Design an enzyme around this catalytic site. Structure first.
Site, mmCIF file in Angstrom:
data_model
loop_
_atom_site.group_PDB
_atom_site.id
_atom_site.type_symbol
_atom_site.label_atom_id
_atom_site.label_comp_id
_atom_site.label_asym_id
_atom_site.label_seq_id
_atom_site.Cartn_x
_atom_site.Cartn_y
_atom_site.Cartn_z
ATOM 1 N N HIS A 254 -13.626 70.054 109.397
ATOM 2 C CA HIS A 254 -12.129 69.845 109.308
ATOM 3 C C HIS A 254 -11.580 70.399 108.032
ATOM 4 C CE1 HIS A 254 -12.961 65.730 107.790
ATOM 5 N NE2 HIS A 254 -11.926 66.048 107.004
ATOM 6 N N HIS B 249 -10.472 68.194 98.344
ATOM 7 C CA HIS B 249 -10.381 69.067 99.481
ATOM 8 C C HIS B 249 -8.957 69.527 99.583
ATOM 9 C CE1 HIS B 249 -9.246 65.113 100.970
ATOM 10 N NE2 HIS B 249 -8.379 65.749 101.731
ATOM 11 N N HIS C 262 -5.701 70.870 102.529
ATOM 12 C CA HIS C 262 -5.136 71.061 103.849
ATOM 13 C C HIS C 262 -4.259 72.282 103.750
ATOM 14 C CE1 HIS C 262 -6.091 66.760 105.002
ATOM 15 N NE2 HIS C 262 -6.054 66.618 103.674
ATOM 16 N N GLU D 107 0.786 68.587 103.788
ATOM 17 C CA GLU D 107 0.891 67.316 104.551
ATOM 18 C C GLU D 107 2.137 66.584 104.102
ATOM 19 O OE1 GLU D 107 -3.125 65.591 104.479
ATOM 20 O OE2 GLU D 107 -3.133 66.375 106.518
ATOM 21 N N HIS E 232 -6.033 67.569 97.638
ATOM 22 C CA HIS E 232 -6.235 66.113 97.517
ATOM 23 C C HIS E 232 -7.459 65.838 96.681
ATOM 24 C CE1 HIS E 232 -3.869 65.363 101.478
ATOM 25 N NE2 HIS E 232 -3.092 65.619 100.445
ATOM 26 N N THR F 151 -5.187 60.864 105.495
ATOM 27 C CA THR F 151 -4.480 61.661 106.455
ATOM 28 C C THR F 151 -5.347 62.180 107.569
ATOM 29 O OG1 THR F 151 -4.734 63.713 105.299
ATOM 30 C CG2 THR F 151 -2.789 62.337 104.692
ATOM 31 N N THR F 152 -6.628 61.851 107.539
ATOM 32 C CA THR F 152 -7.543 62.181 108.624
ATOM 33 C C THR F 152 -8.135 60.907 109.135
ATOM 34 O OG1 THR F 152 -9.259 62.484 106.878
ATOM 35 C CG2 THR F 152 -8.197 64.357 107.717
HETATM 36 O O1 7CZ Z 1 -8.229 63.948 104.181
HETATM 37 C C1 7CZ Z 1 -8.857 62.967 103.497
HETATM 38 C C2 7CZ Z 1 -10.159 62.825 103.820
HETATM 39 C C3 7CZ Z 1 -11.112 61.936 103.334
HETATM 40 C C4 7CZ Z 1 -11.049 60.958 102.411
HETATM 41 C C5 7CZ Z 1 -9.958 60.605 101.703
HETATM 42 C C6 7CZ Z 1 -8.654 61.187 101.784
HETATM 43 C C7 7CZ Z 1 -8.100 62.253 102.574
HETATM 44 S S1 7CZ Z 1 -6.465 62.688 102.403
HETATM 45 ZN ZN ZN Z 2 -6.627 65.027 102.526
#
Ligand code: 7CZ
Ligand code: ZN
Length: 257
Positions: free
Chosen positions: A61, A91, A93, A103, A116, A195-196
């Site tokens: 993802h 990570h 998005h 997001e 993030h 958000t996931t």
């Molecule tokens: O997208 C995420 C994935 C996994 C863990 C914590 C926060 C976020 S926004």
């Molecule tokens: Zn995230």
């Protein structure tokens, strides 16, 4: 299983994860004129001088840059936070096109991507226990716009070739996440969620006002990643963003006037 397609994307997540329709979901649109200045907020403290990155992973993802979170290094505190939160991973998005990908949105504006940096509240001992708590996580969210390159991102970009596909990881030591931060730590904050999936309602969101700039070439390389595993039909890892969710009974606070 969940993903970002027509048949398993964000509008489907609620069937396996009913908290998707919960009271504190993320992301949200930040209406800048409604977000009130809170002069009680503290400057954010970002202490990344001893951060120890380990590895980078394509999880199917996104990609995660993972840290050593076994000692007291790489911590976020202050701002809206009580106590100390330890960096575990970052990570991004991002979109298929420069016009989408973030997001959070700012007065409905979508940035090309969003970073993030995920931190867990040390009072809960590890990430797994922290995500069972309503104050378990603090995510520092940073917008990306396309313009000048971000030199501190390039080390990430260059390793992506080696984790094209789902489940691939690669050693990724000595990466300094201070090179991904804008000048200003001015922020908006509100209570929300991952958000996931599993969309857990654990997060104190801290969204920086000031975006970073990355180049077209840098974001293009994000868009060469794959959601599929090696040996499967290629589906480019693009548009891995959840759209904005209802604010419900929440206030967004600004650290700045
Ligand atoms: O997208 C995420 C994935 C996994 C863990 C914590 C926060 C976020 S926004
Ligand atoms: Zn995230």
């Amino acid at each position: 299983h969940w993903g970002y397609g027509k048949h398993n994307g964000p509008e489907h997540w609620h069937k396996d994860f009913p908290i998707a329709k919960g009271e504190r979901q993320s992301p949200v649109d930040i209406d800048t004129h409604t977000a009130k200045y809170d002069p009680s907020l503290k400057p954010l403290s970002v202490s990344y001088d001893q951060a120890t990155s380990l590895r980078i992973l394509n999880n199917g993802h996104a990609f995660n840059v993972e840290f050593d979170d076994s000692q007291d290094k790489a911590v976020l505190k202050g701002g809206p936070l009580d106590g100390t939160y330890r960096l575990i991973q970052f990570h991004f998005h991002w979109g298929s096109l420069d016009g989408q990908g973030s997001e959070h949105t700012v007065d409905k504006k979508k940035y090309a991507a969003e970073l993030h940096l995920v931190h867990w509240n040390t009072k809960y001992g590890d990430f797994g226990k922290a995500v069972q708590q309503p104050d378990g996580l603090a995510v520092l969210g940073i917008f990306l716009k396309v313009g000048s390159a971000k030199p501190g991102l390039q080390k990430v970009v260059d390793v992506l070739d080696s984790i094209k596909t789902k489940g691939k990881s690669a050693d990724f030591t000595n990466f300094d996440p201070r090179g991904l931060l804008p000048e200003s730590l001015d922020y908006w904050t509100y209570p929300g969620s991952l958000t996931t999936p599993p969309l857990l309602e654990c997060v104190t969101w801290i969204v920086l006002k000031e975006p970073i700039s990355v180049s077209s070439e840098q974001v293009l390389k994000f868009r060469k990643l794959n959601f599929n595993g090696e040996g499967e039909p290629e589906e480019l890892m693009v548009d891995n963003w959840r759209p904005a969710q209802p604010l419900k009974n929440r206030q967004i606070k600004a650290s700045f006037k």
